[PDB]
RNA sequence: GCUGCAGUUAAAAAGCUCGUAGUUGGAUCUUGUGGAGGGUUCCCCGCCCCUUGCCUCUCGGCGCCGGCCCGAAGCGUUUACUUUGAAAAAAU
């Protein structure tokens, strides 16, 4: 958040969960980060570079999450037609 | 009856937010749920949407995302006069930094940033933020 | 799949698929396991797709792969077919199993011995093991686990659809999770017979 | 005649008038005739897409709108290769309104029909374009700067009557109305 | 929902989109004001008049083959009642449950439920005659009842 | 509901199975269709739901019943819809 | 308690329905382009048919070379609403 200078205030900018576009406390413990590993893809074999995401409590205790980490990795791979 | 269509189409969009959805269905289709949502489509708390025709009256499709808070209805509709319009904004927004309270003057309908500038006063319609 | 056919379902597992039962999943369903179903037969029995299964399998596994400690993705069953199976899972791959009854607490105390803080979870049946999804929600663990049609989805992230009633469905399962990991970290690869079989993954089975 | 068989609309016109000319020729020879009953026009008008191609527009006074709908197949088959190199289609001309609500003055002349309101002949105007698919479904879309583009769902019979017309037609509509539509056909028929 | 019982429940008409002809069907629109001009004859009212063409002949509706509705067919002919059917048929109950409440004045319930058929009457005549299809003058009684459905 | 359903497209019958006027667009749910029995050698067209004895002009004298919903017809081939 | 209350159990929905006054009431009848003021389309003249809707004219000015053109005169079916003026004793 800016100022008068355009200097950022806020102690820390919070992290906004994939599907759901909200924002996740200090306090809030059903919020997981989810890390797909990728692989090359002509051999498929892991090569580094980690496709990372995030979910808030809310969708995951209702069981939402299921489809949003499904849709997720289906916008990219590896899903193809499901 | 539906003696208000514009008060019973925001409570569903409301409602679906907050479940979390990004599709809706709202019927039945007036004009004034049309002007009302490009005014708020620019500002940026939905996407664009999708007008079916029917004869009847038509029914209208939704892309929204979790930007939106709350979108509300005031009815009956009063009437505002340019002075009036700050004792209004104080109790209907968080703050006076964002937020828009929306009207409808002779001039169309828009957001109460844009009236104070073209001098027209008129009648409150709703808000959001 | 992904890349084309290196990593797509070949003919062989599809055998190994229908000799075990997989196919085959329980006659009530839930709304979030409408979409993994095809169909129904003439009869109450509810046949799951293998091609959603495998792509299931697939992002599952690397998630297992994506961690870079093995020795902090804690398998957990508590049934008597899921014993066996899981015991050889988490000693041929680097992870930690917890068999038999959970005692509670184990991801959140500071007192018990057993406390633990993994990563990952990775889960045989919620309507067994109830009580260690509910803990899971207090750290931020991700989880992962075995569902069938009639097991409801809550507190997991991740679905690997499954007959699971306890049948050889149960040991085939762990053994191909077991099989993927090592294809992408491991040497194991080639792709082409590993030496290790699900033939000792399956139930104990109490013998004459 | 073959300049004052185009009334309201200016008679001469080079290119209108070498229309009218053979046109009424056609349906004064007796190769066809038994269908062609001395109709008039009243304009004519020649209009480009961004195709790279012309398309020709045949107005008519609008109640002989009806008795073109008839042929409006074998005779248009004809002046397609008769004027050749062109694409061919009928239109109806009307005599739109503003209102007395207040776009230009009133004196109480009449109430202004909503047959002769603007709306419903924008709408009808459509349905002659695409006349043999009989339009099945109509929806709309509204962009982010408020543009508008109109999807048109049509039947799933009759497809290739449309299908090389298919662009020429959206060409037209831009030209009447200042707008932008698109043509599509459904997933299913009911 | 239900104006007089506390119900609620669906079950009206739905028309399809379309609206051509469409195609297959016959009788030009002349042809079809010639068949209903016969059966308003017999003294079948606008109501039946539809059911009667469409169960059996081929038109979908009389309105998508004529420019007007069954009813304005009729009373541009001058051949049109005097009265709405839907108005008659209110009056032409409440006589027989008027019999029926002489012959039996411990029925009770038919006593309640003229109540309700009898103030749907008046409501129905105050949109009619407000719109100049009634006599300003107009009213309903025991003695008008009885002659008006005769 | 998976609370991220689609809504623009529906399936050909699986989210076209519904009431009539819960539909995107409203489609009666009856036909028409073209008889010619031989009790009354003539094309006649017929509506599904008959509401009332059609009659026939041959030998026969009927050709429907007015049940609860659909007609039942007789012993009279004679089908189409056509096309609605 | 209009802004701003409450009525399952704490004080509290007429036993039930009909019904006039009162209050409240569905959908539907116009958009793009050069100049000017502000962006990179969009918000005082005009254009597609409309553009402050018309005429009819005649009396008293402006024109141009008897003849011709355009301001003022009736008004756009009626109101609420909103915006601008006028007119508002002092003291407080």
Redesign the interface.
């Known amino acids: 958040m800016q100022s008068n200078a355009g200097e950022f205030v806020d102690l820390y900018v919070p992290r906004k969960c994939s599907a759901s576009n909200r924002i996740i406390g200090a306090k809030d413990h059903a919020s997981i980060p989810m890390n797909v590993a990728e692989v090359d893809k002509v051999t498929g074999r892991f090569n580094g570079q980690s496709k990372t995401y995030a979910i808030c409590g809310a969708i995951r205790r209702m069981g939402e999450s299921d489809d949003s980490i499904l849709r997720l990795a289906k916008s990219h791979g590896i899903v193809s037609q499901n | 009856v539906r003696m208000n269509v514009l008060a019973d189409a925001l409570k569903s969009i409301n409602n679906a937010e907050k479940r979390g959805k990004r599709q809706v269905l709202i019927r039945p289709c007036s004009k004034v749920i049309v002007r009302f949502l490009t005014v708020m489509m620019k500002h940026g708390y939905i996407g664009e949407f999708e007008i079916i025709d029917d004869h009847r009256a038509g029914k209208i499709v939704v892309n929204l995302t979790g930007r939106l808070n709350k979108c509300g209805v005031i009815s009956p509709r009063f009437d505002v006069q340019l002075k009036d319009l700050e004792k209004w904004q104080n109790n209907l927004l968080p703050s006076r930094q964002f937020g828009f309270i929306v009207l409808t003057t002779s001039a169309g309908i828009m957001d109460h940033e844009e009236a104070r500038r073209k001098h027209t006063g008129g009648k409150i319609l709703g808000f959001f933020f | 799949?992904?890349?084309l056919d290196?990593?797509q379902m070949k003919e062989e597992d599809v055998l190994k698929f229908l000799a075990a039962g997989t196919h085959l999943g329980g006659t009530n369903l839930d709304?979030?396991m409408?979409?993994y179903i095809y169909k129904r037969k003439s009869d109450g029995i509810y046949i799951i797709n293998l091609?959603?299964t495998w792509?299931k399998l697939?992002?599952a596994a690397?998630?297992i792969?994506?961690?870079e400690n093995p020795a902090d993705v804690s398998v957990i069953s508590s049934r008597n077919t899921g014993q066996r199976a899981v015991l050889k899972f988490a000693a041929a791959t680097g992870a930690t199993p917890i068999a038999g009854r959970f005692t509670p607490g184990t991801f959140t105390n500071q007192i018990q011995a057993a406390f633990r803080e993994p990563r990952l979870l990775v889960v045989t049946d919620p309507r067994a093991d109830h009580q260690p999804l509910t803990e899971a929600?207090?750290?931020?663990?991700?989880?992962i686990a075995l569902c069938n049609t009639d097991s409801?989805?809550?507190?997991?992230?991740?679905?690997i659809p499954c007959n699971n009633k306890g049948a050889h469905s149960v040991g085939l399962m762990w053994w191909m999770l077991a099989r993927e990991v090592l294809?992408?970290?491991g040497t194991i690869?080639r792709?082409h017979p590993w030496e290790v079989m699900p033939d000792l993954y399956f139930y104990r089975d109490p013998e004459e | 005649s073959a300049k004052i068989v185009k009334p309201n609309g200016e008679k001469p016109d080079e290119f209108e008038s070498g229309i009218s000319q053979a046109l009424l020729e056609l349906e004064m020879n007796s190769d066809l005739k038994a269908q062609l009953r001395e109709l008039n026009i009243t304009a004519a008008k020649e209009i480009e897409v961004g195709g790279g191609r012309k398309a020709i527009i045949i107005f008519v006074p609008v109640p002989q709108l009806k008795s073109f709908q008839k042929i409006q197949v074998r005779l248009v088959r004809e002046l397609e290769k008769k004027f050749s190199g062109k694409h061919v289609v009928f239109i109806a001309q009307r005599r739109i309104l503003p209102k007395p609500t207040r776009k230009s003055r009133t004196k109480n002349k009449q109430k202004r029909p909503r047959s002769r309101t603007l709306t419903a002949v924008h709408d009808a105007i459509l349905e002659d374009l695409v006349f043999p698919s009989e339009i099945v479904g109509k929806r709309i879309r509204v962009k982010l700067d408020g543009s508008r583009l109109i999807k048109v769902h049509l039947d799933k019979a009759q497809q290739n009557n449309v299908e090389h017309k298919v662009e020429t037609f959206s060409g037209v509509y831009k030209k009447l109305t200042g707008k932008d539509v698109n043509f599509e056909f459904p997933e299913f028929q009911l | 929902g239900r104006m007089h019982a506390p119900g609620k429940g669906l079950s009206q008409s739905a028309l399809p989109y379309r609206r051509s002809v469409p195609t297959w069907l016959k009788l030009t629109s002349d042809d079809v004001k010639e068949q209903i001009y016969k059966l308003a004859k017999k003294g079948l009212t606008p109501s039946q008049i539809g059911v009667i063409l469409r169960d059996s002949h081929g038109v979908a509706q009389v309105r998508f083959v004529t420019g007007n509705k069954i009813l304005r067919i009729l009373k541009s002919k001058g051949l049109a009642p005097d009265l709405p059917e839907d108005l008659y048929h209110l009056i032409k109950k409440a006589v027989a449950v008027r019999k029926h409440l002489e012959r039996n004045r411990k029925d009770k319930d038919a006593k309640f439920r003229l109540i309700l058929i009898e103030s749907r009457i008046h409501r129905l005549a105050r949109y009619y005659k407000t719109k100049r299809v009634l006599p300003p003058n107009w009213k309903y009684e025991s003695s008008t009842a009885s002659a008006l459905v005769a | 509901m998976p609370l991220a359903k689609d809504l623009l497209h529906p399936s050909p019958e699986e989210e076209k199975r519904k009431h009539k006027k819960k539909r995107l667009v409203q489609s009666p749910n009856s036909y028409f269709m073209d008889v010619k029995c031989p009790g009354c050698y003539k094309i006649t067209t017929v509506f599904s739901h008959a509401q009332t004895v059609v009659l026939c002009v041959g030998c026969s004298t009927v050709l429907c019943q007015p049940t609860g919903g659909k007609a039942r017809l007789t012993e009279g081939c004679s089908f189409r819809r056509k096309q609605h």
């Open positions: 799949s992904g890349a290196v990593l709304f979030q409408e979409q091609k959603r792509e697939l992002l690397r998630a792969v994506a961690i929600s207090y750290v931020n663990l991700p989880t409801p989805l809550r507190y997991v992230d991740i679905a294809r992408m970290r690869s792709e």
